[PDB]
């Protein structure tokens, strides 16, 4: 398609003509227009040679602009960027070392097997430089070179120089060097991870007080790789890391908390430092939740693990985790989980105060999680289940459908947890029979009727009401209805006989569900053979239920504590799961 391609006249021809103009201002304008046209998607590859002719200019603005242009092509297609290495290598006597940094990072952008020969010498000769930014860019370029899987035997000297960069005046240089070393050391070659621990740690901790915030992040993350052998070194490291409460919203605080939790192996009987550390770890985690919603979400996901490991740190801070209206939904849910985990014996008196208020909010799923949280509080503490039941009945009387459905769902679980302890409640629930349409709430109500059947005088009518529209219902509802009717037949023989045929010879053979058919036939056979065995096989004493939901694997918990500050805690998954 030669149409609209001719370069004699057009936008590309005009840009090329402007690029060759003698005045540098119009050249800069042309380069800016070229960059904009590239960004908006217009193909301006045919302008590549002329802009390369702009390399040899004393002006720095044009040189910087063409550097950004070449980096833009570097990640799009490396082959186009290869044709500029001849101009790139002019990086020896050029003043203003930021130009050297830009050049070496531009070589860092291009990823080809052909760039190794032309980069080894400039990288080697720029690491030992007086300007700190050139040292920075050399340090990051060594890591980017090590990113590929190759030997590049000069890489040994590269890593030797990188390790030598730890003893440098500028904190940012050593911070970038240690960050690059950490990024390189994820895989361990034959000669790496040397036992140069004491002096390197001393230098890192000395420089930490002067490093930039991100430098502090890098150093403290690298400290998580170290493991101590003597308690004196651990105590010194902890007491030197503790003053880390900088302006960073969570990064510095979270990484320092990671380090302190990792360096937690002492004795509280004689050393009055474990208790003091647990005491002063609270204010940082409390003040983390006064920032921004995303940072608050990350801090909450870390606090979940911190509380799960050592609950005594946040024992008396249930007030700060109260949900504000203006926070997003994820922060609300995580704060709800934190409140549930911290529901001790003494704070319930206010916790149920908050969880009752959350059930009147206009957010449906948040109210659902709030009533489920009320149920979780009831399950956790056996001494406060009566207050939880009273609150749930209060919510039930409010007559809101999305509240009532999950409230009665929770009532089913509470009745399962403490049987024959809230008998007087059930009759009230009988009033809310026609207000349930969700499968979960309907199943919960049917099961509640099935058990304690002798305490309801009109349970036969309640079951007959649902039996009419047996079809067009979920499998859970059908199975629960079958189980409840069979349970009530044994509890109430010779009054509900007509139910047995209507449920077995009509709601089993007509249904196409295989598992439901098997259940119906098994129930028919057991009832036809002898009710004596049916009573003792169906009405067996159901054991309690374990609260394993609010529990995590101790080894997995230890791994997550080893990875507090990173994405593993946010996902609550091992790093091996996402390789």
């Amino acid at each position: 398609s030669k149409y609209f391609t001719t370069n004699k006249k057009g936008e590309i021809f005009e840009l090329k003509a402007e690029l060759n103009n003698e005045k540098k201002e119009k050249r800069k304008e042309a380069v800016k227009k070229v960059i904009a046209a590239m960004t908006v998607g217009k193909d301006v590859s045919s302008l590549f040679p002329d802009v390369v002719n702009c390399m040899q200019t004393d002006n720095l603005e044009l040189k910087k602009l063409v550097y950004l242009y070449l980096m833009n092509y570097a990640k799009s297609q490396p082959d186009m960027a290869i044709m500029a290495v001849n101009s790139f290598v002019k990086d020896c006597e050029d003043p203003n070392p930021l130009i050297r940094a830009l050049a070496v990072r531009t070589m860092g952008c291009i990823r080809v097997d052909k760039i190794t020969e032309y980069l080894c010498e400039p990288l080697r000769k720029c690491l030992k430089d007086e300007d700190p930014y050139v040292r920075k860019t050399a340090a990051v370029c060594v890591a980017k070179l090590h990113d590929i899987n190759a030997q590049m035997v000069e890489d040994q000297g590269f890593l030797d120089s990188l390790r030598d960069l730890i003893a440098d005046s500028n904190p940012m240089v050593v911070a970038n060097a240690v960050a690059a070393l950490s990024e390189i050391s994820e895989s361990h070659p034959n000669s790496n991870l040397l036992d140069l621990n004491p002096q390197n740690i001393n230098k890192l901790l000395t420089a930490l007080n002067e490093c930039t915030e991100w430098g502090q992040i890098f150093i403290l993350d690298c400290l998580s790789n170290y493991n101590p052998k003597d308690d004196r070194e651990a105590q010194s490291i902890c007491e030197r890391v503790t003053p880390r409460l900088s302006h960073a919203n969570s990064a510095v605080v979270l990484s320092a908390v990671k380090v302190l939790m990792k360096f937690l192996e002492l004795l509280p009987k004689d050393s009055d430092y474990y208790n003091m550390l647990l005491k002063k770890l609270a204010p940082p985690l409390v003040t983390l939740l006064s920032g921004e919603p995303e940072v608050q979400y990350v801090a909450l996901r870390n606090i979940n693990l911190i509380v799960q490991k050592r609950p005594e740190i946040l024992k008396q801070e249930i007030k700060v985790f109260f949900v504000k209206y203006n926070d997003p939904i994820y922060v609300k849910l995580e704060k709800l989980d934190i409140m549930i985990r911290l529901a001790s014996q003494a704070n319930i008196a206010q916790v149920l105060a908050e969880l009752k208020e959350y059930a009147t909010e206009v957010d449906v799923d948040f109210v659902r999680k709030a009533v489920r949280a009320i149920g979780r509080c009831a399950i956790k503490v056996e001494q406060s289940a009566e207050r939880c039941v009273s609150t749930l009945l209060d919510l039930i009387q409010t007559k809101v459908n999305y509240v009532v459905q999950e409230a009665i769902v929770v009532i089913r679980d509470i009745f399962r947890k403490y049987p024959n302890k809230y008998e007087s409640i059930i009759a009230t629930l009988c009033e809310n029979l026609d207000s349930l349409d969700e499968p979960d709430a309907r199943a919960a109500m049917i099961w509640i009727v099935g058990e304690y059947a002798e305490r309801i005088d009109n349970a036969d009518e309640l079951l007959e009401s649902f039996l009419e529209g047996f079809h067009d219902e979920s499998t859970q509802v059908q199975l629960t209805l079958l189980t409840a009717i069979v349970k009530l037949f044994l509890k109430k023989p010779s009054e509900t006989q007509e139910l047995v045929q209507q449920v077995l010879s009509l709601a089993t053979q007509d249904s196409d569900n295989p598992d439901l058919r098997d259940r119906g036939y098994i129930y028919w056979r057991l009832l036809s053979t002898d009710p004596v065995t049916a009573k003792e096989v169906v009405l067996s004493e159901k054991p309690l239920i374990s609260e394993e939901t609010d529990l995590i694997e101790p080894t997995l918990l230890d791994e997550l504590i080893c990875h507090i500050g990173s994405l593993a805690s946010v996902y609550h998954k091992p790093p091996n799961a996402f390789v």
Binding site: Y3, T5, D43
Partner: protein, 142 residues
């Protein structure tokens, strides 16, 4: 019948927009944006016959430009694609290897060419040579 004709670029800026069916200005902008979004996704290997609302679009690429014509679901697609190519050839011969910019500085000439070749949502004339002769005699008249 032809619904609308568009000459676009990768930047999304419309360069020709002929509308044979009534629409509001914001409606026209929405339709142009959606057409550009649909066209720019497909590559060369993909078909040129893309369903779009209760219509379809026949489009082709020429260097830095996209040509699109919107037709009904029951019209011969290849005929309209060849009409697109014929219109492109007429423009190219009339503007002496037309470029993208020549569709802006001579937008009224583009409009009169489109009206000469397309009218009332159908194909008016198909012969390049005497269409060009008509255009030259029109240009000669002052």
């Amino acid at each position: 019948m032809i619904r609308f004709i568009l000459i676009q670029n990768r930047a999304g800026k419309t360069r020709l927009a002929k509308w044979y069916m009534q629409f509001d200005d914001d409606e026209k902008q929405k339709l142009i944006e959606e057409v550009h979004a649909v066209v720019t996704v497909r590559d060369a290997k993909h078909t040129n016959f893309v369903e779009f609302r209760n219509f379809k679009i026949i489009y082709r690429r020429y260097a830095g430009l996209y040509f699109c014509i919107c037709v009904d679901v029951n019209d011969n697609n290849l005929a309209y694609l060849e009409a697109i190519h014929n219109f492109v050839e007429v423009l190219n011969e009339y503007f002496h290897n037309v470029c993208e910019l020549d569709l802006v500085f001579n937008f009224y000439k583009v409009y009169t060419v489109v009206d000469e070749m397309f009218l009332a949502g159908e194909i008016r004339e198909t012969s390049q040579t005497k269409v060009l002769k008509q255009l030259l005699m029109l240009q000669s008249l002052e």
